[PDB]
Amino acid sequence: REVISIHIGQAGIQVGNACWELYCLEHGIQPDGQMPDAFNTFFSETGAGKHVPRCIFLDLEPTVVDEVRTGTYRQLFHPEQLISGKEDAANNFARGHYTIGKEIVDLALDRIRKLADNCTGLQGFLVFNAVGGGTGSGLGSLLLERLSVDYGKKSKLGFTVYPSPQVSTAVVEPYNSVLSTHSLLEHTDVAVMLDNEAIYDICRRSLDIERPTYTNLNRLIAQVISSLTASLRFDGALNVDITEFQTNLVPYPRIHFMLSSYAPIISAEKAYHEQLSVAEITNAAFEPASMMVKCDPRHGKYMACCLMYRGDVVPKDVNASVATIKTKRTIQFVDWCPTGFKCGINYQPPTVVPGGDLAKVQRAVCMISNSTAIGEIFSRLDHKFDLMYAKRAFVHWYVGEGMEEGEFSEAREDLAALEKDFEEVGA
Amino acid sequence: REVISIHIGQAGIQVGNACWELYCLEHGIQPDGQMPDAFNTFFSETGAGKHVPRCIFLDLEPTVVDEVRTGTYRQLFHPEQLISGKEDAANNFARGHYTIGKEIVDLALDRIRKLADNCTGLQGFLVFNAVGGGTGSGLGSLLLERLSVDYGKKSKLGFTVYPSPQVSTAVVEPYNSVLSTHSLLEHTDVAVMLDNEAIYDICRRSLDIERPTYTNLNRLIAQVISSLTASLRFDGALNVDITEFQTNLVPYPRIHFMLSSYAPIISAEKAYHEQLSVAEITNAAFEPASMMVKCDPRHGKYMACCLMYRGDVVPKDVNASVATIKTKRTIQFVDWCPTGFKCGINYQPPTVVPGGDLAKVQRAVCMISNSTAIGEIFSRLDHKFDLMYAKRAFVHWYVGEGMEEGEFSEAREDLAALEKDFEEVGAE
Amino acid sequence: MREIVHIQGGQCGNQIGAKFWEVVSDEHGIDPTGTYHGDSDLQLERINVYFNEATGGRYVPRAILMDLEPGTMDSVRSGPYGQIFRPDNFVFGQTGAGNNWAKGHYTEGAELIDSVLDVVRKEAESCDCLQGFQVCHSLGGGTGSGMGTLLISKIREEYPDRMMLTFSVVPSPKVSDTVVEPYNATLSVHQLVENADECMVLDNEALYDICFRTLKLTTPTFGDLNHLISAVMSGITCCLRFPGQLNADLRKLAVNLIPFPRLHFFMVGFTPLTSRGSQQYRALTVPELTQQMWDAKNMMCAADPRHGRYLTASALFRGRMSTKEVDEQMLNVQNKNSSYFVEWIPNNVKSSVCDIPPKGLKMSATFIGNSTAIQEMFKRVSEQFTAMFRRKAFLHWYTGEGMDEMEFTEAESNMNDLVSEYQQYQ
Amino acid sequence: MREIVHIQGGQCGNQIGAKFWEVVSDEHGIDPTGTYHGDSDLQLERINVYFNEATGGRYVPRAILMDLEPGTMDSVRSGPYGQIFRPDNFVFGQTGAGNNWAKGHYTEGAELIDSVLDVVRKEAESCDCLQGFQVCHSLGGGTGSGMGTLLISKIREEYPDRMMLTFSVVPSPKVSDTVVEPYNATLSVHQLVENADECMVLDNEALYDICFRTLKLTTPTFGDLNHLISAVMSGITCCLRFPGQLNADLRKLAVNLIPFPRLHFFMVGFTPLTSRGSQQYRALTVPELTQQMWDAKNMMCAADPRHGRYLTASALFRGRMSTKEVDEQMLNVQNKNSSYFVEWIPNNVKSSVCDIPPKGLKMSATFIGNSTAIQEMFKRVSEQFTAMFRRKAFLHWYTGEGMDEMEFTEAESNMNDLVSEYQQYQ
Amino acid sequence: SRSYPGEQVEHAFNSKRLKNWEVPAVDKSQAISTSTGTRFGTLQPRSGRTQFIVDDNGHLKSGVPKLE
Amino acid sequence: PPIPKLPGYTVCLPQSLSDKGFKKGQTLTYVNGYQREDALAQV
Ligand SMILES: Nc1nc2c(ncn2[C@@H]2O[C@H](COP(=O)(O)OP(=O)(O)OP(=O)(O)O)[C@@H](O)[C@H]2O)c(=O)[nH]1
Ligand SMILES: Nc1nc2c(ncn2[C@@H]2O[C@H](COP(=O)(O)OP(=O)(O)OP(=O)(O)O)[C@@H](O)[C@H]2O)c(=O)[nH]1
Ligand SMILES: Nc1nc2c(ncn2[C@@H]2O[C@H](COP(=O)(O)OP(=O)(O)O)[C@@H](O)[C@H]2O)c(=O)[nH]1
Ligand SMILES: Nc1nc2c(ncn2[C@@H]2O[C@H](COP(=O)(O)OP(=O)(O)O)[C@@H](O)[C@H]2O)c(=O)[nH]1
Ligand SMILES: [Mg+2]
Ligand SMILES: [Mg+2]
């Protein structure tokens, strides 16, 4: 049971840069690559006493890549697992989808093929990308398309980083995000959104870090990924694997967008101050003040929920909590699903990184739900795509790269059909 | 069995500071948070050797909340509960009920939500506020409205501080008090009045402090709250929970205003002077010179009375004293209420705070009664409200902050209807 | 053989029950840890009526503690003889009626009575032959009166052929604890007059006067009052647990006391009750017992019997006594005060003797007189009820719980025609 | 002689069976190394039913662990009694089901069930006289329900003459583990009513209720739930493994319990179950066992039998007991509750007694009641199924794998007319 | 979503017993249409096969009514 | 010191409050192959 994780772009390989540090720290692997068998889901054992990860960091700018090649983990990552182009994609979906992709993706998928051949019990792929960039969106979409034709039936857990409503580091990112979604619809099996604004909010509220950088964002995202892959790695009283979210959370082939959350995110002060039981952290996982995507699930109605648990949790209290949540009315489901939860329990508590800002808690919850507030997100995103495109702005760059103007029209109508989908499905 | 406390305003959280110091002293909890299971009704034992209270101090001006954050009890309270705004409501019901409340109250009640979720056997809520100020009146009322629509049938003890008749610190506080009472009518289950001039007279006469500060007032208020929750905390020969005042004191669904009193408030040398016994302290709990509300119940008719007793007291003598009170004709009960009393006895005597002014006593009484002197007070207040309202003084502030004149008119006429209600209830 | 299961409702009921089981436990010599430590054999054979041998000399009481708040249960569990009950027999709730009979009969009973019924039904089928149920509660509180009332109703619906005792304390205006006392008492009595077989009326005012005048105690705590009530209950069912020359079971006393099915409110006394200083100057003869037994200042109710007619009466004696002196005293007391007894019933006194006295005493007695002076107390409550109900004070609390006004009209009608029929037979 | 081949499907089945083989090995005195170490030679004479001697006192279980992911298998092999299973019996896939009944019945079963059949066949003709097969699995998951179901259908096609038990946990609405619970439960029940000989329903709510009301635990890990189910399974097969005064085999139980070929869904219980805080206050008598038996709080199913009528019932007693008390208790509980027992069947209770109690106890029992109140559970599942199927939620992960819609409609018709005939016989 | 009667455990699943302490959701509990009407009750039996309300990919057919 | 196997008698320590950790080992694994794969059970 091995899962390989691919990272596309500047954000993708920076999230993986923190994720793989967490993995080596959890399995006791030195940054050299050898211990001083649960690691087998992530690290292939080569020769005698040497563990080389199952990942591909791929990007177009060689800056952050060869920064990894020179940093602390020179020896850990395989020399050729890190794949790097020569010239950037420059926030340009078309440039990263037609010009540069046609030479980088065939080498990448050739590489990932022999990683799958080295693999034995492949569970699925999990991808890491931000749809704001041109690298993450353009050849990210091209790679997912050619992965779906290669394997198809294996799951592709996508943890994307969508642009925030107002906090933004780009201008054309609505164009990029829409054109990326238009392919992330029919390629990704399960797509989880992660907005940097909401993570800024959490870092301010709970961890009381007044000035966080991207590392704290990457660090707690790594905590989330570790918390939903812990069932594969460690044994639990009720474990739930990768290919489960495909069946429990996606009621329709084009409705797959999941609001992730986590609890307890807590500092070293409030942890010592508050009693952490299963009831309140199950409540705290549902309060929109602790979600990873800036939306208001109270404004919508849930479709299905999944609750990963870690640490010291006995089934009586998690089931009693699910009961309490069912009795409350501050949150309400759609009129379809009388069985709206998917419980999962793992024995191992979450680990801490020396230098991290999270305290060590005996238990944690990671909620991956589905609602219609995601339909609210796409409406806001489509409005600011509608503003810019009404005046034909920035279209010149994309047309020059090679996208025909129609791509724009059909991507806009594809989102329009997606709005109708959420509107009718929630009825 | 738990009960949680919310404090709205300057006076609110100062009284709460006194109360929580008292509770720590009563349960032997060192201020850093750990002892060197009765506490389970106020503190939740977190982890191993740590007790966090079931309370939230919420306030708009940051000064006093930051003072608490840097005071002695930095470790006791935990910094996620002390809700502090940036700028004050500034003696302005409108500013505290429409402008700033609508941003702060959601966080407040969403903290209350998870406090109650941690709770197990919730007896009720209790709110602490002075209605003269801006925040405690305005967003106090807002919080009570949304709390009642969130919970509905649970008891909410409101220990409010009304402005004294002749001694007063503010000017628009009549407007504030009227607009606060208009909602305190239909949202509070049981509302206890505490003026400051009566407490000043008590401290002058009995405890013979000629120059008291607010700590003494808040200290005896905390003594009163402790005396009426000691039945929940410690075992008594005849105990009484919080939900009982809900039943046994409010005859009609709009008449819930209770004169509180206490005895014996006696200094050390006078305690050396006088013998303390149930008969004379029960007598002492009934004169106007020992009530917390500056009114004369001689002019009123008692509707009901609740008598909490603490310490070395047996039921035979409380029976004797209640008997002799009912025989004496200086005070009279209303016609349609023949059984106007409710006794309650608790074993543990009231403690002392070191540096406090009250001496340790074998026994004490806390009376929560109901009369028509409050119907007198509300007319005395409506007078000086109509005074300023006839010329529309200070109304521009509220109208600019977001109300209109209809709300003033409806609050005024609501208090008029309440006056008529008191008249008809007193009428035999 | 014959079985009595015990039900305790509310705060007053639970503390009466705690002292009652303490009294019975050394009546039969068992220690507070639950093993036998007595000397005579006569204590062994008749603890099937109250206890169950569990494993290797463990006698647990046959009781069902029942209320809404743990304050009374923990007050019970703290003291000695508190660790003898089975924890499965403690039924408790997380709310509290708060002296709201509507809460104690419509909202909270609705989710607790199912489990209370399961535990009492288990404790009734665990034995072979029920003699009767025995409940101790108040008529002022909510969780005692209200739920105890609902439980009585459901039990009498289920087991109609078995006896049923209710030790209920009623209020007085001088001792007036709850403000809604008449609203609770009137509705509860309106239920007790169609469900309970007989009710033994107690009240605290008379108990205070007894510990004031007779016992000459300085500071009578509630423990001593609860000890008076328990000695009364012990005197009631001593004949079941101990052999006598003239036996008298509960059903035997019921048929002898109740001439008409609705006149079953008994006033109670107990003797000997003498001050420790005056124990030296007295003698111990049956005259010395009856002269104190028939005193109006020794009844445990606020109903002076010389204001009305004794309909029937009963006396339960304990100790090695001479029946000729017993019956002659009963005859003399009947012949002297001949106007206070009803005319159309000759020899109005049932009498019985048991051979085992309470430990430490030579002779004791228990009096259960069914007089018509009890309509004093029922009117004393009925006028207060209609006084409040003319102005509809405190009514919203009851109405909000789903109780209508016609329930109050029926309750007052039952109270009124009841005292009408006492006045008829007086 | 009579042989029971044990099959464990899926996560639930693998963990329950892990505790099951722990308890059975403890009863027969086999150490976790695999050697006999018991004391009484009663334990030798009946281990052919559950074990095979390999080499010199090396007894291996007659069990087949089947699933798709090694995760459950490695949790089994880690703990004690993990090194006793035969490595050839670990038939085993590699993909993973994913709560998809179609994946567990159409895509992966088609390449795994052949090897599973090879293993179970080899283990079938290894012994002489099959008594029957015994599968433990779940109804919510995919790899347990789907793969187990296809195995049941194939086995019943192969060996149709031998018995078959199915210990299956069922979903509840408030412990709603998977989201496609009705899509899996409805399809599996639709298969069990034409393939399984008799089914024993289990539910986690009834198990929690038992652990908190009777056991009164603080942290009921899944180890204890799986232990409860293990004690029930051991109490079922006890009569084969130890001699009794009245022997009751599996076929003997089936012919007494199943009046009609479709009414074979039993709700199970077990006694005695008491807290360690109240193990001092109780006694161990046949009436005390049977009172705990027929209590509604002691079923292991989320269906109150008081809402319907008992068709038939069975009681398997263990320990040195008196059959007069056995039959008298079953006769009394039948006459006293005349409404909950069906009218057109006299003597609705089959009873049996074995003379070997489980280790550490004096006397135990096992209740198997074929009630009619199980139709409320099937109502609960069918209603949820129609709620989702009306609007086609989650359907495509089934439709794309081969399934049609007619299987869902047929699953509905069989669930709906089955609850129709339960309601008819009620 | 709806919460169905458990008939054995609802005594333990009362919202007040689960430390909800607020006015609970009875929307979820009235949509059942049980026999008694309260949470203690028996459901109604259902017969037949359910036709398809929705079109493919979760879009309500034109004939059936919906909330706007 | 010997104790019965009956339900609820033994209360296990949580073992997660301590730093133990519960890595599970791949003792059952497939062998690299194409269409045909062989299961392998190890010690
Ligand atoms: N969460 C997170 N987002 C990041 C991080 N670094 C960059 N981003 C996001 O990156 C987005 C812009 O695209 P980038 O990831 O910088 O670039 P790219 O996807 O490699 O594409 P090109 O810039 O065209 O090469 C913004 O939305 C950023 O918030 C990081 O460490 N964490
Ligand atoms: N009993 C008592 N009353 C106080 C105390 N402090 C202030 N008050 C009363 O509070 C009333 C005015 O409200 P404040 O508490 O001063 O301030 P506020 O309620 O927060 O309102 P804002 O000034 O708008 O923030 C005055 O009538 C004071 O008498 C105190 O310590 N004890
Ligand atoms: N004899 C006796 N009566 C008591 C005791 N405690 C309370 N009571 C009586 O109980 C009545 C109040 O009922 P209460 O205890 O509140 O009932 P509950 O609230 O329903 O449990 C008062 O009239 C008291 O006289 C006691 O210890 N002994
Ligand atoms: N009693 C018990 N039930 C379990 C255990 N593990 C899972 N379950 C139940 O199995 C149901 C879900 O079935 P699942 O585990 O997905 O079956 P599978 O995935 O096909 O093997 C849940 O309702 C759980 O209650 C266990 O160890 N003990
Ligand atoms: Mg980039
Ligand atoms: Mg202020």
From TrEMBL, chain F:
Compartment(s) where it occurs, according to its Swiss-Prot or TrEMBL record: Cytoplasm, Cytoskeleton, Flagellum axoneme
Transmembrane segments: none
Top-rank lineage group of the source organism: Eukaryota
Protein name (record): RIB72 protein
Species annotation: Chlamydomonas reinhardtii (Chlamydomonas smithii)
Span of the entire protein shown here: 6 to 48 of 635
